[PDB]
Structures are given as structure tokens and as C-alpha cells.
Ligand binder design. Structure first.
Ligand SMILES: [Mg+2]
Ligand SMILES: [Mg+2]
Ligand SMILES: [Mg+2]
Ligand SMILES: [Mg+2]
Ligand SMILES: [Mg+2]
Ligand SMILES: [Mg+2]
Ligand SMILES: [Mg+2]
Ligand SMILES: [Mg+2]
Ligand SMILES: [Mg+2]
Ligand SMILES: [Mg+2]
Ligand SMILES: [Mg+2]
Ligand SMILES: [Mg+2]
Ligand SMILES: [Mg+2]
Ligand SMILES: [Mg+2]
Ligand SMILES: [Mg+2]
Ligand SMILES: [Mg+2]
Ligand SMILES: [Mg+2]
Ligand SMILES: [Mg+2]
Ligand SMILES: [Mg+2]
Ligand SMILES: [Mg+2]
Ligand SMILES: [Mg+2]
Ligand SMILES: [Mg+2]
Ligand SMILES: [Mg+2]
Ligand SMILES: [Mg+2]
Ligand SMILES: [Mg+2]
Ligand SMILES: [Mg+2]
Ligand SMILES: [Mg+2]
Ligand SMILES: [Mg+2]
Ligand SMILES: [Mg+2]
Ligand SMILES: [Mg+2]
Ligand SMILES: [Mg+2]
Ligand SMILES: [Mg+2]
Ligand SMILES: [Mg+2]
Ligand SMILES: [Mg+2]
Ligand SMILES: [Mg+2]
Ligand SMILES: [Mg+2]
Ligand SMILES: [Mg+2]
Ligand SMILES: [Mg+2]
Ligand SMILES: [Mg+2]
Ligand SMILES: [Mg+2]
Ligand SMILES: [Mg+2]
Ligand SMILES: [Mg+2]
Ligand SMILES: [Mg+2]
Ligand SMILES: [Mg+2]
Ligand SMILES: [Mg+2]
Ligand SMILES: [Mg+2]
Ligand SMILES: [Mg+2]
Ligand SMILES: [Mg+2]
Ligand SMILES: [Mg+2]
Ligand SMILES: [Mg+2]
Ligand SMILES: [Mg+2]
Ligand SMILES: [Mg+2]
Ligand SMILES: [Mg+2]
Ligand SMILES: [Mg+2]
Ligand SMILES: [Mg+2]
Ligand SMILES: [Mg+2]
Ligand SMILES: [Mg+2]
Ligand SMILES: [Mg+2]
Ligand SMILES: [Mg+2]
Ligand SMILES: [Mg+2]
Ligand SMILES: [Mg+2]
Ligand SMILES: [Mg+2]
Ligand SMILES: [Mg+2]
Ligand SMILES: [Mg+2]
Lengths: 172, 185, 48, 58, 159
RNA sequence: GAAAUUGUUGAAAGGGAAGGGCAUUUGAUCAGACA
RNA sequence: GGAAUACUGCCAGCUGGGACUGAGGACUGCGACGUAAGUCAAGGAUGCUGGCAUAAUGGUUAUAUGCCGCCCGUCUUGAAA
RNA sequence: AAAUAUGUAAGAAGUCCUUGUUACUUAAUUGAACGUGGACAUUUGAAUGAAGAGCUUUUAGUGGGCCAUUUUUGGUAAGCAGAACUGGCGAUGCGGGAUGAACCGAACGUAGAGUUAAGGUGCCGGAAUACACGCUCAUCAGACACCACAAAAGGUGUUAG
RNA sequence: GCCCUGAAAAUGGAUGGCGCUCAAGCGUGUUACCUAUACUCUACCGUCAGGGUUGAUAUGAUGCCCUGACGAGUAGGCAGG
RNA sequence: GAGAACAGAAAUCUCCAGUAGAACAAAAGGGUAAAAGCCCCCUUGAUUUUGAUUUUCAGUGUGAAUACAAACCAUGAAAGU
RNA sequence: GGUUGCGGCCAUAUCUACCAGAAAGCACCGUUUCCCGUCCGAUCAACUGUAGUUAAGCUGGUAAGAGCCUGACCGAGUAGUGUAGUGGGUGACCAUACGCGAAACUCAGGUGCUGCAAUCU
């Protein structure tokens, strides 16, 4: 659905005479602007509590920045998604440098592999896989092996004008 | 485009000069549009429009209807103004003094007034005498006395008068006008 | 009275554009309509 | 040769060109269809109180 | 073919209310109506004489006549592009005084009050009703109330 | 002594119709204003 | 610990390039700049310079070229049919 | 027992006080109706709007309708037949959907400049053979709403669970 | 999920055509860019409305002057020509 | 339901339970329990005069209906109807 | 507080089963000359208030009672629904966006209130 930010959102049911200071609940929400975020928040709250936006209030919205944005990380990701004939829980692992990048490719991957659009997905958990060997999906362990190296065969350099006088070469 | 909310290019619906083609009338109108643009007296404003009025919206005022207005408490010395003809009424036996300013005065109406030593004044004469209409009583005549308005709104249970030509028993007095011949109206 | 006095403003189309390929869904779904909160300014400024 | 039977299509479009005109309202409505016994009395009642207020200009 | 008699279509609407059949309670009759009173109309199926036609069910008119056992009620019904006036002869069993105006009356007698309580003190009147206003700022606390973090939940089947 | 329609002369265009609209090249033709 | 930067927003901060337009026809208004006299971009273009002075610009016409263009009249829910 | 629809009310034609009229009505100068006299002005009693509001006369054409979303009856079904609310076509061009009455965008005085809609940008054809991550190789691949169809059932093709 | 089997009709033919395969295909994201009789600003026409102005000694008072908004149209109405 | 010679599935007698599961000409739906049903008593308001009103509606007619007014009666101890 | 007569709301007043009720009242209760009604002085009528009784009526209280009434982020923001899209899907259908929002369920808490008049340890 876009380029994401992650938000702490905090809300509560509106106060009353007999119940002033109601409980206060938080969600980390992955959206692109705060307007989508707040909306998403109410979407899940009503999937959980007796509340609607009409009878409750947003208390705080804050963007959370990645703690070590230039550290590579092995993400484990949990998702609930809807297919054309059923709904489904799922676990992928993503390797990137922020939760926020991670969630971007997840959404991509789901749309690509399972034709799932944004409306049809529920991120359940996104958490850092602290020690390798708890990394489980092979397309990731692949990139943890020691002293790793690889070529990129068949170089295609992009021509900047319609004709060329050489004949290219894919060396690299 | 525009979601209009009222009909476009609508004429205001009020006359703006008279339909009439009389020089003199067109001069009187020349006079009062001046006085109405330049004196802010309401009277001049009323008169300017009454001049545009057509023959129906100008029923005649009778000298007796005139006599009655002066009979108003506080009003005997006012000058009655009539933007129309004034007519005679042999039914009153005692007509007061005063000063009537009208468009036309019938022969007898003019006599009756004068015979009691009153004055008949044209509007322009009235204007010079009273450019703000000071001390003036405007009178209009009975519009819905016209024979025509008898037949407006004809329908069941309205009581209104058939558009009818010959008119006696056996002209439209049977089935539909009495309980014993079908039904009543 | 202050506000009725002001004739409805007559803006042009946004200059940057609308930012979206289809206008007639809600802002929250990647469209243009509805309460878009304080992002209203970026838009209007491109239309004024 | 059959044809359409009935529809209200377009009907409220027409009703709204020129109105649904509100009912219109009067200070002093008609006593029409009011109890005759009442009205009869109400008459002389009024006649009396008029006569009085006239005597008030003695 | 078709049928459109007087009480056609009125099966559940002139019906009697669960567990409320029988005699009408007597208070219905100790009520007193004067001309000008606003009444609501609602047919009592058990009282066949002097019954509002179904069109006037749920409707609110004004008394214009008072009779041994009835009130005459004027309702404006709208036919065509317009309203016409209808007078209804209704027995007291199909009418009740409308609370549609109690608010107003409440509000006026109150409004005349705080107008004196103001005026004869040194004004600060302010007695028009205003719509629900948006919320002012506020500071919500945490002492005894740290936010609990919720996530969405996995699919499951219970069955 | 119109038009349909025809002959000749001049000019022009034409790869399964012609005619039309906006626009400009090209050719022909011409008004006006300048002093 | 103490900074930088991104991102979003603001400035009645400054400044370059390019396009269309120039309605109006004494003065009259609201202002700006100056010690002042004056001045000004403040209720709609002026200044300076060149070329032609005639088919040159422009009109008309024929043709060519880009895109576009079904046969009108009628009755009909609906016609190029 | 909803939702959507739906009646009435939100004042000067209002609220309150003092006490006249009658043949109605009361046990009753009791009531009921209509009043005379007095007290309180625009925060006078929610919002938004109002190129004003009200009213009268007279007359044309029309009285084959069709379509879309949603509700919906008959029928296996129909580009079938019949209702509900709205919006359209008919009566209407303009941009998009190659094409098309009804879909999408948008409604038309003559024009300049700008920006957009819906829909597009390999070439036809104005506009990135643009960026990015996956997926797919079809000895009848696939390619954008309305829309110009495909189903049960199968695959040790390949992908992710 | 994509692909493949399941998948048979009559003139030769249609993702609009060419053609495209790490697409010019399918899902999804991000920018930029093209262009409606629509939107913004301006000129001009006309319609409707609101102002101003009889003061001669010169020419239209149905005039003249300021201003604001609006413009689809069959049947059909009316108006100026 | 439980009880009584002939008497049985069904005759007539008694007690208990009983929200209506019956009955109210008729189609069906509303309605009704010291009644709107069943038994009895008394009766002719199924009458006289001429308007208003509701449904259908053009707010025409007709049908059917409602609430009054002016009579004369019925019934009831009566309010009443 | 009891009770009676007349009531208003018309189950928190009803239903089933037990037990308790002082004082007054109400009640049951005795009688058949009279008005009056019956197959039957049971009902209905009258007479006594004297001869008798709390047994029933009535009132109240008990019950992991039946019913009924009330409450609640119990269920459930569920079902259903107004509005939107050139959203998904061959379809049947289904997600999403801005709103409105049940019923059953489950748990807890109750089990007549009150007006006028007379009367009472
Ligand atoms: Mg972090
Ligand atoms: Mg006459
Ligand atoms: Mg810009
Ligand atoms: Mg641009
Ligand atoms: Mg830019
Ligand atoms: Mg698009
Ligand atoms: Mg701009
Ligand atoms: Mg036929
Ligand atoms: Mg047909
Ligand atoms: Mg027809
Ligand atoms: Mg039927
Ligand atoms: Mg009857
Ligand atoms: Mg000759
Ligand atoms: Mg040309
Ligand atoms: Mg100029
Ligand atoms: Mg000029
Ligand atoms: Mg020349
Ligand atoms: Mg030259
Ligand atoms: Mg030629
Ligand atoms: Mg040509
Ligand atoms: Mg073409
Ligand atoms: Mg024809
Ligand atoms: Mg045909
Ligand atoms: Mg409403
Ligand atoms: Mg306003
Ligand atoms: Mg106005
Ligand atoms: Mg007509
Ligand atoms: Mg006609
Ligand atoms: Mg006709
Ligand atoms: Mg449509
Ligand atoms: Mg037609
Ligand atoms: Mg159109
Ligand atoms: Mg086109
Ligand atoms: Mg197509
Ligand atoms: Mg091509
Ligand atoms: Mg191109
Ligand atoms: Mg680019
Ligand atoms: Mg689809
Ligand atoms: Mg399959
Ligand atoms: Mg597979
Ligand atoms: Mg294909
Ligand atoms: Mg293509
Ligand atoms: Mg793509
Ligand atoms: Mg244009
Ligand atoms: Mg403009
Ligand atoms: Mg036009
Ligand atoms: Mg029945
Ligand atoms: Mg009884
Ligand atoms: Mg009879
Ligand atoms: Mg009638
Ligand atoms: Mg008739
Ligand atoms: Mg009738
Ligand atoms: Mg009938
Ligand atoms: Mg005792
Ligand atoms: Mg005896
Ligand atoms: Mg006994
Ligand atoms: Mg007895
Ligand atoms: Mg006992
Ligand atoms: Mg008792
Ligand atoms: Mg219980
Ligand atoms: Mg659902
Ligand atoms: Mg819905
Ligand atoms: Mg739409
Ligand atoms: Mg859809």
C-alpha cells in the first residue's frame, strides 16, 4: 500500500462519570501516513474490544524509528491472510536492515506469491531473530554461511542512446 | 459546470415602464422616476410603479369611496391621490371639500368635487405641490370586483359561476347542481 | 457572518497533480476524498 | 399489444420542480366542522362582549 | 384481482401488543383534551368505532374540536406536489397528548427564569441551544495506567 | 434569356467513390492603411 | 555525552530562466519611498531601435499534408442502417 | 427487533398576571371558548444556506418510454417479462472504454495561457523500451471494470505456506 | 499462486493492430510525464440583475455610465429581427 | 383428568384443571373473558331532518364509514349505550 | 406498620408447595316471617349480629422453585445495514473504506409500588 513508517498508537474509550480514566491500549501500526495509521488502529481495536471511534479517543500517535538502521537483521514475520477460498496463518522470514523495510517487502511478497492485497493481510508479529540457528527458512540461511562471496554473471549495462558502435559484452 | 439552484436568466417579473404608448403618461413617468431616484420619499416610489400598472390593476376609485377615506379619523385635510380615473357616485348626497390628484376625472366626478368647491389636480401638479407626497392619502380601487374573477377557480365545491352565455332555468342547473339529479356540485 | 461574507473560493486544479491514480476513493485507501486532516494544506496550496 | 402497467418513475422529480409547498398557516383558522352547540353559544357570547367593548366608548 | 379496502394491509399495525390485550386501562379516559393541543395518533385495534384510517397511524396533528367521546384532529396530508388539510374524527382511545413539545415548554419556562436571574443581576444572558462541540484539550495520565500493547490474532476454527 | 444539363478553351487534382471540419505550405487573386 | 543530518512544516528571506496577455484612456482611490523637494512597480504598457512601405503582413480561392468527418428527411425506447 | 426511510416540535400567531361576555357547561361566576388592562425585544431561543418571498390567470407539448447500481416477482433461462428508490438515455455534444444510445470523466457562448479528470506513455500515438520486489515458458500462454464467457475434476511443472 | 489437462463448428482474422517472454505478461509499490468543450486567470459577445445620470448651450432616456453573475437542448412557449 | 345402573369409542349426572387452545352467517386477518362468546328479559335507533368528515380521489361521483347538531323512541336502578 | 371501601400503574402483583398471622377489620358463619330468585335459600334476596370459627378466604414469609421485571465493555462492535471504488472472484459470493448497529446467549440483581377516605394494640 506504500512506503511505510511504523507507529505507536495509543487510544482509549471516552471517559465517563463512573469510569473516568479508562484502560489505554497500544498498537504498533505499519502505515504510510498517520491518517492511515489511526484508521488502522480503530480497525483492529474493534476486532478486539467493545469500542468504535465514535465512543473512544486517540491519546497518542508517535513514529518509532529503527534502532540500528545500518545493521543487518534476520526478521521473523507472522501474518494472517485471506485467500480466494479461505483464510490462513503464515510465517516467513525476511532479511533486511529495518522492520520498516522488512514490512515493505513482505507486502510485496504476499501480493506476488499469493496475490494478497493490503486489505487482506494482518501482520501479527515482526521480531528480530536474535541468534542464527533459529533462522528457519532456507532462502535466508543461505546468506549466513561464513566468508560468503558470489559473482553476478551476465552484466547488462544500460545504453544511453539508441545506436551503438561496438557490440556489447556482459563481462563482470 | 455549476449545479444551478435557481433558474438562469430570469426576468424579474415586474413592469418597468408602462405597456402604454401615451406621451403624456410617458412624461409623467419621466417625472416620477426622477423624484424617486432623487428624493428617497417612499410615496414617489409607490406612484412610479402605479403608473406602469395596466387597466385592470387600476380599477376606478369613486368619489364616494373618496368621501369615506376623508371620513377617517385625522384625515379630512389630506389630499387624496388616485393613480387612475376617478368616477362619480350619485349615491352620496354630501361630498366634502378637499383636493384630489388623479390621472383622469370623469365629467361628473370632476363636477361633484368642484361643486363642493374642492380641487381636481393632475399628478405633476400634485408633485410640484408635494414633492415628498406630504400630507397625501393614496387610494386604490377594488381589483377583485371585476366580472372576470367570478369564474376563477371553478371546480367542485368551490362556488364560482360557470362560464355561461344564455342563463336561465335549464342552463346548467340540473344533474350536478342538486341532490335530486345525480348529485350536488 | 465573517465566513459567509467570503465568496466560495475558486481554486484551480492541483499543480503537482492529485498524487494518486484514482481520486474517487477515500484518502485512507489511496484516493483523494474525505478528511485527510492536515494534509489538506499541501493540496490546497497546490490549487491556490 | 401489451405495454407498461405502472411506475412512479420520475414522479417526485416533477413534484419538486415547483414544490412540495408547505401547508401554509393562519392566525385564526376556520371553525369549520366545529360542534354546532358550541358555535351557537360562542356566537351570542361574542355578540355580548362586543356590545360591552362598544359601551366602553360611551 | 387487487384489493384495497379500508383496513387492508393493517395486519400487525392494528394488532394489540404482546400481553396487552383486553380492557383499556381507565386513565385513557380521564385524560382531558382542549382545542390546540398536539396529539399523536395510534389506532387501538380493540376499539372499532371512531378509528383513524391507517394512513394517520404514527402521525401528529392538532385538536380543532372537542366532542362527547372524541376530538377532531387536523393533520396536513400531502398529495401531489402539495399539502391539503384533513380533519379527523377520533375517539379518545386512539389519541394521546404529545411529548413533542414538553421539551420546548420545559425550555421556555427555564429560559424566562435564567433571563430574570441574569438581567436583574447584571446580564450575561446566553440562552440559545448549541450543537455538540468538539472536545477540548486534556492530559491523560499513566499512573496506574500504562498502555497494554495489543496485536491482531491468528485464524482459528472453534467447532 | 436563370437552373438542371451540354460542347469547346484555360487552369488543377485523381493507387477501390466524391464532398466536409480545424490548421498551415504552395499557386492564383485582391481590399485597406500609409504618405 | 554532545553534535550533524534526514523527514515534515514555516518565512509579509533573496534571486535566475521561459511562456501567454497589455482590457482601460485627463485628473479623482488606497498606499509606498524620502528631512524635504520630490519620487514610485501604488484604481489595466511604456520606453528605445531597426526593417518594409508592398502583395511584404492580411483576405479570398485552388491544391497538398496532419488529425478528424457515415445520408438527410421521418416515425421510433433505439437509424448510417 | 435494526439500518435506511417516516409524523410533529425548536416562540411576538410566544410566555405570564389582573378579570369582562354567553342562550354552551358546572353543585357552583364552576368551566369552555373569545376578549379588555399589564410585565419581558432580538442569544427572541439549534445548525447551514437563501441571485428574495408570496400570490393570480391563461395556454403548449406529453399521456408507446428505454437503460445502470441496489432492493425485487414470474421463468431453467434470455439482449425475456413485471414492480421499488435514485441516477441516466430519450432531448446531449465534449474526453476515455479501438468500435458502440444508457458505463467512466465531464455537461457545451467566441477565444488565449495554464492545470487536471477518467484513461494512458515499446511502435502505430501525445507521454519513462522509468524505477523496484516477486511470479509465470504454455506443440492453440497472457494481457484490465461494464464487455463481449467457461465448470466440476486432475498434474511428481514451478512457487510460497 | 502462476502455468498445464479438462477445452468440439462451420468465408480467413483478431489482447484495437504490430508485436512482446529478467515482457510490451500477472500481483504490488514509487516517481515522473501526456491530454477534455471540465477547473483557475484574461479579452470579446449576449442574457439576467444591481447602481448612477434630464442640466442646458448638440446628436439615441426605448438612452448613456459603473458593476456582478450566468450561457447544453428535442417537443414546445415566448422575444428581438 | 377423575367419578355414576343399563351405557359401549360416542347418550345423560358431578367435580377438578383450563389465556381462550372455542365461539362470533360467510374468505381471511385483526379484535373480544363478570365480553364481542352461551342462556334469559325487554324491545325496533334497521327510525325522522339536513350539513361536516375519512378511504378510493380530480381531493369529482358512487360505495362504505366516522364524529357531532335538531327530533322522536328503546333499554337499564343508573352512569350510559 | 395492619385493615377496609374506592382506586392508579396492571406479574417485581402471576404460578407451584409449605409455614406464620396479634389487635381491629374483612371473612366464613346462623335464620326463612317479609321484598326477591331458584330443579336446589349452593348462587341470588331478606332477617339476626345473636349461636359459632381462623379451617378456608385474605395478608405475609420460605424455595441453588417455574414465570416475570431490571442491569452489564456476558455475548458482540458479532448478525444485519446507509454510503464508496475501473476493489477480489468464471461464478456463487467475499474483503476493504466513512458511518449506524441488533436478537439469542451468559452472569448478576429483584419479586408489587402508590392515591383518597374511614378504622386498629
Ligand atoms: Mg525499533
Ligand atoms: Mg356585480
Ligand atoms: Mg509546484
Ligand atoms: Mg507539469
Ligand atoms: Mg515539479
Ligand atoms: Mg488508471
Ligand atoms: Mg496556481
Ligand atoms: Mg393494446
Ligand atoms: Mg413491451
Ligand atoms: Mg402506457
Ligand atoms: Mg391482493
Ligand atoms: Mg357499527
Ligand atoms: Mg432571345
Ligand atoms: Mg483553408
Ligand atoms: Mg492599452
Ligand atoms: Mg488600451
Ligand atoms: Mg495593395
Ligand atoms: Mg517586399
Ligand atoms: Mg483553379
Ligand atoms: Mg478545398
Ligand atoms: Mg475517420
Ligand atoms: Mg417515417
Ligand atoms: Mg420498432
Ligand atoms: Mg427528517
Ligand atoms: Mg445567509
Ligand atoms: Mg437576495
Ligand atoms: Mg397546461
Ligand atoms: Mg393539458
Ligand atoms: Mg392532455
Ligand atoms: Mg448510471
Ligand atoms: Mg421521442
Ligand atoms: Mg450526456
Ligand atoms: Mg472520441
Ligand atoms: Mg472494449
Ligand atoms: Mg497500427
Ligand atoms: Mg510518443
Ligand atoms: Mg522518468
Ligand atoms: Mg471484477
Ligand atoms: Mg482447480
Ligand atoms: Mg501446484
Ligand atoms: Mg485471449
Ligand atoms: Mg497495446
Ligand atoms: Mg505492473
Ligand atoms: Mg473553451
Ligand atoms: Mg471566466
Ligand atoms: Mg441556449
Ligand atoms: Mg374472522
Ligand atoms: Mg362486566
Ligand atoms: Mg337498512
Ligand atoms: Mg364524501
Ligand atoms: Mg362525475
Ligand atoms: Mg365523497
Ligand atoms: Mg366497496
Ligand atoms: Mg379476631
Ligand atoms: Mg318461600
Ligand atoms: Mg345460606
Ligand atoms: Mg344476599
Ligand atoms: Mg391458618
Ligand atoms: Mg377479601
Ligand atoms: Mg426464579
Ligand atoms: Mg460477514
Ligand atoms: Mg452493506
Ligand atoms: Mg461512480
Ligand atoms: Mg462491485
Amino acid at each position: 500500500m506504500a512506503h511505510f513508517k511504523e507507529y505507536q498508537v495509543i487510544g482509549r474509550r471516552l471517559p465517563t462519570e463512573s469510569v473516568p480514566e479508562p484502560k489505554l491500549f497500544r498498537m504498533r501500526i505499519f502505515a504510510s501516513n498517520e491518517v492511515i495509521a489511526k484508521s488502522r488502529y480503530w480497525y483492529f481495536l474493534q476486532k478486539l474490544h467493545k469500542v468504535k471511534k465514535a465512543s473512544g479517543e486517540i491519546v497518542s500517535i508517535n513514529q518509532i524509528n529503527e534502532a540500528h538502521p545500518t545493521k543487518v537483521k534476520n526478521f521473523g514475520v507472522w501474518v494472517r491472510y485471506d485467500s480466494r477460498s479461505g483464510t490462513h496463518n503464515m510465517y516467513k522470514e525476511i532479511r533486511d536492515v529495518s522492520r520498516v523495510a522488512a514490512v515493505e517487502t513482505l507486502y510485496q511478497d504476499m501480493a506476488a506469491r499469493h496475490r494478497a492485497r493490503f486489505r487482506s493481510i494482518h501482520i501479527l508479529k515482526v521480531a528480530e531473530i536474535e541468534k542464527t540457528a533459529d533462522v528457519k527458512r532456507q532462502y535466508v540461511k543461505q546468506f549466513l554461511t561464513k566468508d560468503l562471496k558470489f559473482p553476478l554473471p551476465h552484466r547488462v549495462q544500460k545504453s544511453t542512446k539508441t545506436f551503438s558502435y561496438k557490440r556489447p559484452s556482459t563481462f563482470y | 459546470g455549476i449545479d444551478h439552484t435557481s433558474k438562469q436568466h430570469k426576468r424579474s417579473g415586474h413592469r418597468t415602464a408602462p405597456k402604454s404608448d401615451n406621451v403624456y403618461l410617458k412624461l409623467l413617468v419621466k417625472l416620477y422616476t426622477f423624484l424617486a431616484r432623487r428624493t428617497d420619499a417612499p410615496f414617489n416610489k409607490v406612484v412610479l410603479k402605479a403608473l406602469f400598472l395596466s387597466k385592470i390593476n387600476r380599477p376606478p376609485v369613486s368619489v364616494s369611496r373618496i368621501a369615506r377615506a376623508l371620513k377617517q379619523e385625522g384625515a379630512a385635510n389630506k389630499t387624496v391621490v388616485v393613480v387612475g380615473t376617478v368616477t362619480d357616485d350619485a349615491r352620496i348626497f354630501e361630498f366634502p371639500k378637499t383636493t384630489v390628484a388623479a390621472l383622469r376625472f370623469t365629467a361628473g366626478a370632476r363636477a361633484k368635487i368642484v361643486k363642493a368647491g374642492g380641487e381636481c389636480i393632475t399628478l405633476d401638479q400634485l408633485a410640484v405641490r408635494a414633492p415628498k407626497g406630504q400630507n397625501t392619502l393614496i387610494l386604490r380601487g377594488p381589483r377583485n370586483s371585476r366580472e372576470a374573477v367570478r369564474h376563477f377557480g371553478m371546480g367542485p365545491h368551490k362556488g364560482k359561476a360557470p362560464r355561461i352565455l344564455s342563463t336561465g332555468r335549464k342552463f346548467e342547473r340540473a344533474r350536478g347542481r342538486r341532490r335530486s339529479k345525480g348529485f350536488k356540485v | 457572518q465573517a465566513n459567509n461574507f467570503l465568496w466560495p473560493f475558486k481554486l484551480s486544479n492541483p499543480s503537482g497533480g492529485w498524487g494518486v491514480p484514482r481520486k474517487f476513493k477515500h484518502f485512507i485507501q489511496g484516493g483523494s476524498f474525505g478528511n485527510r486532516e492536515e494534509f489538506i494544506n499541501k493540496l490546497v496550496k497546490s490549487m491556490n | 399489444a401489451k405495454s407498461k402497467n405502472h411506475t412512479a418513475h420520475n414522479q417526485t422529480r416533477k413534484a419538486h420542480r415547483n414544490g412540495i409547498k408547505k401547508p401554509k398557516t393562519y392566525k385564526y383558522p376556520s371553525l369549520k366542522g366545529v360542534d354546532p352547540k358550541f358555535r351557537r353559544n360562542h356566537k351570542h357570547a361574542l355578540h355580548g362582549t362586543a356590545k360591552a367593548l362598544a359601551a366602553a366608548k360611551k | 384481482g387487487k384489493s384495497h379496502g379500508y383496513r387492508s394491509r393493517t395486519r400487525y399495525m392494528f394488532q394489540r401488543d404482546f400481553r396487552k390485550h383486553g380492557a383499556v386501562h381507565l386513565s385513557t379516559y380521564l385524560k382531558v383534551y382542549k382545542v390546540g393541543d398536539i396529539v399523536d395518533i395510534k389506532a387501538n385495534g380493540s376499539i372499532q368505532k371512531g378509528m383513524p384510517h391507517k394512513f394517520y397511524q404514527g402521525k401528529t396533528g392538532v385538536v380543532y374540536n372537542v366532542t362527547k367521546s372524541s376530538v377532531g384532529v387536523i393533520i396536513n396530508k400531502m398529495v401531489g406536489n402539495r399539502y391539503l388539510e384533513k380533519r379527523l374524527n377520533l375517539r379518545v382511545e386512539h389519541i394521546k397528548h404529545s411529548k413533542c413539545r414538553q421539551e420546548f415548554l420545559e425550555r421556555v419556562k427555564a429560559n424566562a427564569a435564567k433571563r430574570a436571574e441574569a438581567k436583574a443581576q447584571g446580564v450575561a444572558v446566553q440562552l440559545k441551544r448549541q450543537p455538540a462541540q468538539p472536545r477540548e484539550s486534556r492530559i491523560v495520565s499513566t499512573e496506574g495506567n500504562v498502555p497494554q500493547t495489543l496485536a491482531p490474532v491468528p485464524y482459528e476454527t472453534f467447532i
